Design a protein around this ligand. Structure first.
Ligand SMILES: O=S(=O)(O)C(F)(F)C(F)(F)C(F)(F)C(F)(F)C(F)(F)C(F)(F)C(F)(F)C(F)(F)F
Ligand SMILES: O=S(=O)(O)C(F)(F)C(F)(F)C(F)(F)C(F)(F)C(F)(F)C(F)(F)C(F)(F)C(F)(F)F
Length: 554
């Protein structure tokens, strides 16, 4: 009995939560209360299974049960139904932006019913983030609960809560985006791509770890994510705990940076492990040359065990390169692979695969130079203007892309600047390029829902590893027809005056996207000249005797 097994392994609380999450991700549009009803029925049922694993319906898969419950798609049978539920996950669901009500209202609701409030949190995130790393969402719910527990008792409920909630929202969106890439990686590119990812990350993270260890953690982590991305949240959370549990029983085989996370309560622990600092690279590790370029058996060993050897390479290269983005290490490993694929078949492989690392230069240089160039641009512009720059860039690159998406991605793109450009070069590239993988992936998923740009589609369906160079390589499509100057898109409301800094940025940014859409191939100064026109008009209308009409007159 799986639902019992999981209920047992997860405990009711996390079971409930994961089931809610699973429901809210399966039925994003469905009301909270219909989800909790389903969850309770499932939980109630799970309990009957914990008690007798032979009770009538307890041997059914989690898929059948959730899907059966969900069905209270639905016309379909398993496993086509679960596939159906998964494919209907909506990365951009038509759901009201979660509008934070005032703290006292929230704090009242939180105290009115903590679980319901906490379940409401899960539900609202999960349904908005249908790929949200479900166990991680439990961690968020815990922190959300902790926020509300403490901050609701605070003198300044808002001043306590808001920053914390802002942190969790941000962390949430980051985690969602992040997990979204795992699911996209897994689902669009397959297990191997994810495995490659994981070998690269974990090798970087756990360079002291033996390859077999990195592999074991990779197979387990992959299994975690496959399950999570597959809406198998229960297995996923459970396998995650198992993985956290494994890692923590095996820290000395994995990382010396694990001390603190492995002491951490279950949810914190996995979260902690998932983002532990890269471990110290083992001292005096040799170059990959003897094994991967220099050996005469390279061709043989690749061929004998391709993915292992490539994994060993990726492991060996990644563990040596926490200063490389995962995608880079992935690119290098793909390059290695493909070079070996041609060298091994070439007249003298030893000869030509000895040169394999020379192909690595451009691959390594490109992100570096990109990260360096764009981060100077960032340091010149700061996050916001860096966002405006990228927003224009991307709008010009892929103008068909919905502006909200454009804005969101560009903003996020620009956020990598803030996150990464602060870092010295040694931490910039993994930070930047991997966050870039996350953000582009956003662009990718957001756009996929309503594809309107063949370039985005192209760049997103192509090698995940190469997704970023692909967008980077994109230049202005002139095959894009500017949109006529709709007033409504450039006639902001007086609500702009009341907008938070961020929201007024999103708005200028939105205008900036639209303006670029209205008139692409306009240069930065001309774009600046209407952006400044807009902001002035806004400044004017915002301080006008009557705002709403001042605004109307544009
Ligand atoms: O070079 S690639 O990244 O394209 C790659 F071939 F997929 C590879 F990453 F090297 C890889 F070998 F496939 C791998 F990603 F490492 C791997 F598939 F994960 C793997 F290492 F082979 C593995 F599947 F995990 C295995 F090692 F077999 F356990
Ligand atoms: O080259 S692109 O503009 O297409 C890009 F992929 F978005 C990008 F170059 F990575 C970029 F987003 F523009 C970018 F500026 F490089 C970046 F992604 F934001 C970035 F390079 F990561 C950055 F933000 F500049 C970074 F410097 F990495 F922080």
């Amino acid at each position: 009995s799986e639902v019992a097994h999981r209920f047992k392994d997860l405990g009711e609380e996390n079971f409930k939560a994961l089931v809610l999450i699973a429901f809210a991700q399966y039925l994003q549009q469905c009301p909270f209360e219909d989800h909790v009803k389903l969850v309770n029925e499932v939980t109630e049922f799970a309990k009957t299974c914990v008690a007798d694993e032979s009770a009538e319906n307890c041997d059914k898969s989690l898929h059948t049960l959730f899907g059966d419950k969900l069905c209270t798609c639905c016309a379909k049978q398993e496993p086509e139904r679960n596939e159906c539920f998964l494919q209907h996950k909506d990365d951009n669901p038509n759901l009201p932006r979660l509008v934070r009500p005032e703290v006292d209202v929230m704090c009242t609701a939180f105290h009115d019913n903590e679980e319901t409030f906490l379940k409401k949190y899960l539900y609202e995130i999960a349904r908005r983030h249908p790929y949200f790393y479900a166990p991680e969402l439990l961690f968020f719910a815990k922190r959300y609960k902790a926020a509300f527990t403490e901050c609701c008792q605070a003198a300044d409920k808002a001043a306590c809560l808001l920053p914390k909630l802002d942190e969790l929202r941000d962390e949430g969106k980051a985690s969602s985006a992040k997990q979204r890439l795992k699911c996209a990686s897994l689902q669009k590119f397959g297990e191997r791509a994810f495995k490659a990812w994981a070998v690269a990350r974990l090798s970087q993270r756990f360079p002291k770890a033996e390859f077999a260890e990195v592999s074991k953690l990779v197979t387990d982590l992959t299994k975690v994510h496959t399950e999570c991305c597959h809406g198998d949240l229960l297995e996923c959370a459970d396998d995650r705990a198992d993985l956290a549990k494994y890692i923590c029983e095996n820290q000395d085989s994995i990382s010396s940076k694990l001390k603190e996370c492995c002491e951490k309560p279950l949810l914190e622990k996995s979260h902690c492990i998932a983002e532990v600092e890269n471990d110290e690279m083992p001292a005096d590790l040799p170059s990959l040359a003897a094994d991967f370029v220099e050996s005469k058996d390279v061709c043989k060993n690749y061929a004998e065990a391709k993915d292992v050897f490539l994994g060993m390479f990726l492991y060996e290269y990644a563990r040596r390169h926490p200063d490389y983005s995962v995608v880079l290490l992935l690119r290098l490993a793909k390059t290695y692979e493909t070079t070996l694929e041609k060298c091994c078949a070439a007249a003298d492989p030893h000869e030509c695969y000895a040169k394999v690392f020379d192909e690595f230069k451009p691959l390594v240089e490109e992100p570096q130079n990109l990260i360096k160039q764009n981060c100077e641009l960032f340091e010149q512009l700061g996050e916001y203007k860096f966002q405006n720059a990228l927003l224009v860039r991307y709008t010009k690159k892929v103008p068909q892309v919905s502006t909200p998406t454009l804005v969101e991605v560009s903003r996020n793109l620009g956020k990598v600047g803030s996150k990464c450009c602060k870092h010295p070069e040694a931490k910039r590239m993994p930070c930047a390029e991997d966050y870039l993988s996350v953000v582009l992936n956003q662009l990718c998923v957001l756009h996929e829902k309503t594809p309107v740009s063949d370039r985005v589609t192209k760049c997103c369906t192509e090698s995940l590893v190469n997704r970023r160079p692909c967008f980077s390589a994109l230049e202005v499509d002139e095959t894009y027809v500017p949109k006529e100057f709709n007033a409504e898109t450039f006639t902001f409301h007086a609500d702009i005056c009341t907008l938070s800094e961020k929201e007024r940025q999103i708005k200028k940014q939105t205008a900036l996207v639209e303006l670029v859409k209205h008139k692409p191939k306009a240069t930065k100064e001309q774009l600046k000249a209407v952006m400044d026109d807009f902001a002035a008009f806004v400044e004017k209308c915002c301080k006008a005797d009557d705002k709403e009409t001042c605004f109307a007159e544009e």
